[PDB]
Symmetry: D2
């Protein structure tokens, strides 16, 4: 496949219904060797099972809130891989109140801090820790959402954090690009899945996308996955600092 | 003038050569009554002198790092003004290393935290504290820079923070707009002034703008000030969630 | 007012319920002297009445389909005004079928040609003919719509033409800016008025804007007019090559 | 390859040093069957040789200025292919004066007409003529340039036409998307090649991109080709109405 020989680390694989899982499947299909991170000892079993589905036994803990863990992640990975070709960043968090209802109601200094720390800072923090072992043609990919560009109900503090994240894609691309490393985001559409505890229902947005997007259908993790695999590959050697919409064209209409 | 009767609070007036001073002059010219914030007891004298130039004796301390000070600011202002019609947010900070040279060299969790806390969080934090006393036709204005949209050398962590700030303009506009309150930013061009200690030289960017902008000239604090006064006024009642470039058109070219 | 002494030519004033009429009222209020164009002898009476409402007897025919008429317009105006300070371009047309239903159904080479000729070409064509008599601080303003940026139902071939028009704003700004002349567009929201014969109903879009825009209200011709007067004035001396949304913030949300 | 079984028609292959040739090579490599258009009898030999390099004997005349030729193109193709899976539109023209020096100097009604007719209209015109034979998962791709988004020296009337072209991508995506057809553009960076007779030198822009782009290198036809092949493939099933920059990240910086 078009990722033959590439070694790729994926973060944020929490279930088989998420974008990271879709990206993992596409990458494995195209010949990549994969490794994964997890958060918390209780969930090592889960990620080991997921990794096993992709022929991988390389799983490592990494709470991106902790500098020491970010550093140890790449020290551990390096014992297996002398170089890293790809990074998929699918990590994001905000306290429930900061992504529900009114923007100001959920705004506190700590809520803001946490959301930006985990959802934005973590991407260039991982990039910086990985940098010495990155191959010259490495590709770093993060996931964003239209709520960074335009105000979407409930998205609130996460929209601020994703805007900072998309800016980090541009600054990272400049910092790492002289070496040859590319940095991009996919602005993904919503996936047809039940929203997690705390997160407001995706129901209305999913229906609205299905009815108004040019393709009249919601995007699937297979589609986001194939786009991600492309960006992680040498097929995309001319593409960097890009935020690519993989959303059935929804961003381009007024619904 | 077109701001007759409007009462406007301005933050970030540090010298007579800055954008805030230009906005203050235009607002006063058009009939506004003004009030100002300052940071640190040693500089109360300075801001009192500046405020006096605009016929104002209303000056208040506010370190936006401190929740208690943000709350006390509006409690104090309210003893003089039963309603607030305008807010100008011209506050921004990042540690020197986080806005010099390579993006990753200057990236630390604390540098990131501080830059986003002071430069992005402070805007909706002030808005939230002011909200009860805001008039129905109030207008909140912040200042941004093209480095939020595209990567500019040295701007680094501030580009991330300004991207979050511009997103906050959109989310604030939705939160406050039902009441009638407007929220906008001016993406200002660089001003012909010597960069502060720590900040890298503006020399190259100023020359590049003068040579490449459509108007072949750098923007002045008078021009940014007049645009700001417009956005703060009922002339701009149809304008919200907007990031208006006041930069001699520089954003619109490839130089 | 802030347009004292400015002499401004307005195109496209067809009724008292349109944006051009709103811009005319704001300009007159702020001290401008006005002149107007009309299309077709049968409607000279109408435009003379409208012009009279603004204290003007300066009305001139100009079918922008005809090069000779564009040239004669400024020859005629020059007999009254030795210099022109402002131009408002509110002209736009596409054949009914090219702005109804499916984009491809209404697409023909001639429909495309006409729409771009009248709606896009006419702006820089007028600018070029006016150029010798433009003051050094002149300001040229055109009107656009969100359908240039994103696909909106029924807008179809007009969306293509408005995209070309917004690009012309940028290229004109560079061409004319060395002299000091500014060129901008307002991307206006829909006005609460009944759509003309041939044009599809605005009903659904008006309701959607009222329900989803940050200000929860449709824009008015007074609001678009005041924004236009600002852009035409020296208050906006730092603003060029800009497409300013005056749309209650609607462009900035996902409704 | 990832285009196994796909049948793709390419326009604008004029030499082996152009983007279309790069797209053809990538498509052929990934398993596509190709067909080509040419303009003018004197150059049928040339395109037959190029097509032969890709294992194709399917070459057809098509001057997009002529409705009858656009219709006949697909009638002829249909005798060989019962369905069309891909279209690559790499056609563009403006009279020399309309893309040199000052924007207004080169502006005439006829220059404007021709540039928009050939460079913008031709894309949805080809799409409309092809529509009945398009497969449900067909993909239509056009080529654009940053001059559509921002003003670039000399680009002038072509910037207007490319802006209309990018808008046509959005409207086409909506028109064709219910069926399942995708429509995208690549905004390509300049290729290291000598500019054609009439076209101003690429020298300065090529140097500027090499020095300022994140990847510090100009894009190659191989890179644009691989990105094009991706967009034409089912890997990109979630991507439509997109303008993808393949330009070494140059669009994302202020150089």
């Amino acid at each position: 496949g078009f990722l033959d020989g590439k070694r790729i680390l994926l973060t944020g694989l929490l279930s088989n219904r998420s974008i990271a899982y879709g990206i993992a499947k596409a990458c494995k299909r195209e010949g990549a060797e994969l490794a994964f991170t997890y958060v918390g000892d209780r969930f090592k079993d889960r990620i080991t099972e997921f990794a096993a589905e992709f022929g991988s036994e390389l799983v490592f803990p990494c709470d991106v809130a902790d500098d020491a863990q970010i550093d140890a992640l790449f020290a551990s990975l390096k014992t297996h891989w002398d170089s890293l070709d790809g990074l998929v960043h699918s990590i994001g968090f905000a306290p429930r109140e900061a992504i529900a209802g009114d923007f100001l109601d959920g705004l506190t200094r700590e809520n803001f801090r946490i959301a930006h720390d985990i959802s934005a800072y973590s991407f260039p923090a991982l990039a910086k820790a990985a940098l010495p072992m990155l191959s010259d043609d490495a590709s770093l990919l993060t996931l964003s959402y239209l709520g960074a560009e335009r105000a979407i109900p409930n998205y609130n503090t996460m929209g601020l954090a994703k805007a900072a994240l998309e800016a980090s894609v541009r600054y990272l691309a400049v910092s790492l690009g002289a070496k040859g490393v590319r940095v991009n985001a996919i602005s993904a559409g919503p996936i047809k899945t039940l929203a997690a505890s705390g997160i407001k229902s995706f129901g209305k947005i999913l229906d609205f996308v299905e009815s108004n997007s040019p393709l009249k259908r919601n995007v699937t993790i297979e589609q986001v996955g194939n786009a991600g695999a492309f960006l992680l590959s040498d097929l995309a050697s001319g593409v960097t600092a890009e935020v690519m919409h993989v959303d059935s064209g929804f961003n381009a209409v007024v619904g």
